[PDB]
């Protein structure tokens, strides 16, 4: 379901309040904690063996930042998301072979992390808009599987 003018305004409004050097790190870190098999994709990243270990790993926070940045891009280019993530699709699908269900999980963890931070400001209607967005990034990301 595409974006109507009201929610477009709503999501971009609160994306501006997002701190761009943490939430990405908490989203990835929570993905690695809540869905631990995803760790396998990061043996290069070192210590991931406990939550607090994960949630402070400088690699993780570092990596997160560029994932959030990837998300920012999709926001700016909703009308054509698959083009945006064309290259990303290739790396994740063709190179690493990440099962695309894992994409959906990360989008939902990011949505959780927006709720954690923004609290009551993350209303059901603003979640509804964001759920449209993340499902776009997950779908665009697996386009090469299709």
């Amino acid at each position: 379901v595409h974006l109507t003018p009201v929610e477009k305004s709503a999501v971009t409004a609160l994306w501006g309040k997002v701190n761009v050097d943490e939430v990405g790190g908490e989203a990835l870190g929570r993905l690695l904690v809540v869905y631990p098999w995803t760790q396998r994709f990061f043996e290069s990243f070192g210590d991931l063996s406990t939550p607090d270990a994960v949630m402070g790993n400088p690699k993780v926070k570092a990596h997160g930042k560029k994932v959030l940045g990837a998300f920012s891009d999709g926001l700016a280019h909703l009308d054509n998301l698959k083009g945006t993530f064309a290259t990303l699709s290739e790396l994740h699908c063709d190179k690493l072979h990440v099962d695309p269900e894992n994409f959906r999980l990360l989008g939902n963890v990011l949505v959780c992390v927006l709720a954690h931070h923004f609290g009551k400001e993350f209303t059901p209607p603003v979640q509804a808009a964001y759920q449209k967005v993340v499902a776009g990034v997950a779908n665009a990301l697996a386009h090469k599987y299709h």
Partner: protein, 141 residues
């Protein structure tokens, strides 16, 4: 399968919901209906508008069942027997809808109890709701 830490995580986290359980049930419900409009086809007889009394009442039922699942976390299949007959035999809910509702419950909790919603507690709660979902979508009678 829940670990010892999972169990303690969930019970202390739930105890913090306290008197807001029913309220959190109804909000998770509303979030699911707005976020995932296909789930509405399961409630064709519900008034689904904002502030709906039917949704508020149903939320309380769902919250109370989750509370009882917490009380009975070691023997959930027996404790949830009647709910699995309803959901697995009569309604035949698609399991993907339980993942949507569980996600919305975790969004509600993170929005309302940020200090409780640590990464570890997040994981424990995710496993608990997955376990409840499996029982409710499994025909074991």
């Amino acid at each position: 399968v829940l670990s010892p830490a999972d169990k303690t995580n969930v019970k202390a986290a739930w105890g913090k919901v306290g008197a807001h359980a029913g309220e959190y049930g109804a909000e998770a419900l509303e979030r699911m209906f707005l976020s995932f409009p296909t789930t509405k086809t399961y409630f064709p007889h519900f008034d689904l508008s904002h502030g709906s009394a039917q949704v508020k009442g149903h939320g309380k039922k769902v919250a109370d069942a989750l509370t009882n699942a917490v009380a009975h976390v070691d023997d959930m299949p027996n404790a949830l027997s009647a709910l699995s007959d309803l959901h697995a035999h009569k309604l035949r809910v698609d399991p993907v809808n339980f993942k949507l509702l569980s996600h919305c419950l975790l969004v509600t909790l993170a929005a309302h109890l940020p200090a409780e919603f640590t990464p570890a507690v997040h994981a424990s709660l995710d496993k608990f709701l997955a376990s409840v979902s499996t029982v409710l979508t499994s025909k074991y009678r």
